[PDB]
Symmetry: D3
Subunit: 119 residues, 6 copies
């Protein structure tokens, strides 16, 4: 019933920008903190950014701090990731996830969207 | 201006019940955890209950646990305190307050509502 | 050495009620927050409710809020879930789990108890 | 002695911008989350923004969200508040303060810096 | 009534040691995180250490780290502060206090215990 | 890029002592809380101790409380576990891990170091 659906991924040149979206339904969106999780090739999933239910607080992992911006529009029930100054190391499948005693199990994540950074 | 308006207090007999209400305006209500603060005669204020922005989490001080229930209705901008099994020691002015990093300054609580428990 | 043992599951009609118990040993029970985790057929585990060590605070996922009550009796070293107004979607194996940087690994959960909601 | 020195305030027109600074000494700066506290004329203090020790997490009060940006430079021992789109209601003395379990006592804030927004 | 009784303070030479105690009554001791609060002459109160309900987590302010050790005995209803390598700057009234959402109002601390560090 | 490298494990007699180290690189060490995770034969991983980025707060699981000490030297970018009064049940592979919404995925842990407690 809880559904998270991502879009906005694709190919991008190094230094370029991209915005990911995640549409949520089946729960009161504003009641949950939400995160973006990065899954690079051959690597474990890594939470790179988090935002509170109200949008009043955000957190960034060092690997994306200063380049990525997490935001949400609670009126549109949508979560965003603005990815700027993209580098090859940003190449990964990105998922959105609800908070839980850190993130929910991956069965409940978005379907994932691949971001490929290439010249 | 942020405004919090308490009501619902009054006179009750020991063992009686009351339901306090707090109407909020001037901010997005659901974005703030809220608490009820007790000020008994000649005593410092004490937070006796707390509820998260979403209403998903609640906390009760020991002195009140099992007797009081905090709840909120975000569509109505209201916070409630159901007080059962009242005793003379519950006699106090009750305030609602926004969580700050903990509770906001007393300047931002209500004018309060007086509960007098007496025979 | 840490042991969590559940009981109280079984068959129930839609709209009916059931209470799950979880007996804990091998650690100071009151020193740990405890949760109930739902595992519906073909679905990932989901923490649906949580309670602090003292019992002073509780949390509920939206899917169970208003119908389920988590509680604990620290004098009996036992954790409970009161499940009311059961619906078909509540059909699942329920586990108890200690908090950790959200819940402990599932190796440390209770053995699970199946709840089957059927007419 | 722990010392916090605010500056950067002054006179600005509505819609203008200011950047406040706070220089810290007497403690390991990066070990403490820091906040900015607003004291408007005749009002109690209000924490309007908060940043973690590492600068990795930030929080904004509703009244300030989308207009102010808190940041820190741990190598310089400085905390900043970028204030955009100022309005007359932002007129206040601004203090920086260390997180305590929430905010430290007012004795440990600065002497503050006055922001006057007027035509 | 909730009551907290501090003792163990007194006169010591620089480099000396003291062990403060705080006896609690009127509440379930293990249900509350507790802190030690320093009030030096002419200074605002400062929480210098904090311990969780279970005693499982502890925090120390920088000014005290590596010299003081906070501990508790829940079966005896006692909180302790071991103070080593005392210096003249540790001269203060020491209070124990319950965590509130952060610290409880000063009305609920002890009458305190005076530590005088002098030659 | 983030790397955690452990050392200091090996054989030890019951009652003996051992210190584990974990060298970190590829991130600002002081910006992350760090933990030690125990993986005994045939058992799930278990976080036994945690320390904040500054070193100001620590947590211990009951199974190690009073015997193990977690510490960090942020100037050496190194995390330690001092293991005292070792018992057979302490036999396990120990990993260091960064905090995340509890610990990061095990792909990002140290390589592990085996501690064997035998007469």
């Amino acid at each position: 019933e809880v559904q998270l659906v991502e879009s906005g991924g694709g190919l991008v040149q190094p230094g370029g920008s991209l915005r990911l979206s995640c549409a949520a339904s089946g729960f009161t969106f504003s009641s949950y903190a939400m995160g973006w999780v990065r899954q690079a090739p051959g690597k474990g999933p890594e939470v790179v950014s988090l935002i509170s239910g109200s949008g009043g607080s955000t957190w960034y992992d060092d690997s994306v701090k200063g380049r990525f911006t997490i935001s949400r529009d609670n009126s549109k029930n949508t979560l965003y990731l603005q990815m700027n100054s993209l580098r090859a190391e940003d190449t990964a499948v990105y998922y959105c996830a609800r908070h839980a005693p850190s993130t929910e199990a991956p069965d409940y994540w978005g379907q994932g969207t691949l971001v490929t950074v290439s010249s």
